[PDB]
């Protein structure tokens with residue numbers, strides 16, 4: 001028992017992290033087979049970042065302008081290309097530590113592990129969720145771009161995020177491994193800002209099931225609700241709408257606990273309307289929305 | 303910016319995890335050089351667990367009774383011995399992935415990363431603190447014993463915890479790598495229970511400094527307090543006493559933010575006396591005490 005924000009073991013990703021330097025800009029890259037992936041911003045100067053034309057900047061570079069270091073070893077760059085907002089640096093050597101992998105794009109409301117890295121060296125690992133507004137609430141300092149987010153299933157690493165920047169509210173934006181941004185953000189200097197966000201309802205319900213599995217029951221009640229009435233309440237509290245697919249996805253947790261999904265929705269309605277009256281759930285005094293139903297099943301199945 | 307419960311990258315520990323089976327009991331072991339460390343409970347039957355004499359149980363075993371599997375490869379056991387509550391299984395082969403390492407015992411109030419493992423396979427990584435009452439609030443299911451806790455400094459893994467059991471409140475107990483339990487717990491069946499706990503004051507103050515570094519300032523005030531008056535309040539709220547060494551340890555964070563330690567203590571006093579009035583700090587509606595001053599400096603230095 002217990003319930004923690006748990007990341008995937010990071011070793012398979014650690015052995016892919018490298019340092020990429022262009023000019024005076026140093027950031028992280030992801031070395032898979034004989035390619036190193038990194039943010040294309042690495043080819044920019046500070047002055048370049050207002051309306052940069054990356055095609056022009058890149059045509060003015062050659063392979064020797066890219067310094068790739070894998071721990072102690074220099075990797076010889078033998079080709080370079082752009083793919084959306086990422087750069088692909090073809091190298092001399094295939095990474096002998098390449099895991100089985102996929103590039104997947106995730107949905108808002110899905111979670112993933114982040115391996116924060118600086119100068120190609122892994123620093124820490126933590127769990128993040130893609131917010132409805134396509135930002136992530138990460139923990140990143142200068143030099144962290146190029147750090148990646150991922151999930152692991154069996155022995156296969158599904159990379160879903162490369163870090164690019166910090167928005168003015170301190171939340172983070174980046175792309176998928178194909179270089180396509182999550183959300184309406186760009187890799188140039190603008191007044192871009194996170195849009196309005198909402199709470200991920202299905203995840204909050206998953207976490208209430210985790211709490212019941214772990215012995216927190218005080219918020220349960222004998223009541224039930226309809227999906228429509230619940231969604232009226234959700235809309236009032238800036239929660240996203242609950243669909244029948246969400247209800248279906250919560251099926252196994254409902255069966256394990258014997259608490260119907262619409263009964264748990266009645267509990268959530270009460271918690272939104274009344275607050276917690278000084279109590280906690282799984283060690284939190286707020287409703288947590290960064291655990292998916294899958295995260296709960298993975299951690300609480302025993 | 304941002305502030306997350308961040309674990310150390312787990313790869314160096316992943317390459318040390320193995321499966322140990324004795325009879326019908328399977329658990330995890332830690333393979334370093336040519337020794338595998340695991341909980342001595344592996345030699346028990348269910349009936350053995352009321353007043354077991356482990357010296358008797360072990361003298362009735364031979365090397366061939368221990369099955370050690372490192373992923374796909376069987377490791378031949380060539381010696382066995384007890385060291386307090388852990389078993390040391392000498393094996394045929396030295397682990398080629400052994401990191402630089404130390405066995406350190408930590409203090410209550412210190413944090414560490416936990417690599418949760420099942421059947422020798424790493425499952426997840428998360429950050430934990432040793433509570434004042436020598437339990438940890440982990441996330442562990444059946445089969446997780448033998449999982450370890452650790453910190454990493456430079457390239458050296460300091461192992462500080464091996465998991466043994468779950469107490470009736472759902473919190474966890476285990477030993478150091480020398481097999482000595484943290485706290486007054488034993489590896490036999492008793493009505494043992496976690497003792498009274500307290501909040502780790504110095505860590506809460508560290509986390510308030512993290513919040514200020516990250517732009518949460520609403521809880522600051524122009525007031526200050528004496529150490530004695532603050533500690534009267536701490537005692538009232540089941541917080542541990544703040545020492546001058548704690549104040550000294552908070553020195554760098556105080557200097558970085560320009561908020562004197564006893565000023566931040568005045569803020570903490572107000573928060574304990576008034577609550578939060580519906581606000582949050584670093585995304586929490588409660589005062590967080592599982593970040594050390596070191597954890598804050600490591601993550602918030604930028």
Ligand SMILES: *[C@H](S)C(=O)c1cccc(C(=O)Nc2ccccc2)c1
Nearest residue numbers: 039041142143144145163164165187
């Ligand atoms: C690095 S995180 C990166 O890819 C990037 C993309 C877009 C914009 C920036 C930026 O403006 N400033 C930097 C520079 C270096 C490191 C972090 C942020 C960066």
Ligand SMILES: *[C@H](S)C(=O)c1cccc(C(=O)Nc2ccccc2)c1
Nearest residue numbers: 341343444445446447465466467489
């Ligand atoms: C395994 S976590 C372990 O070392 C252990 C030590 C002391 C007591 C127990 C126990 O009673 N029951 C078990 C058995 C197997 C796995 C977890 C707990 C276990």
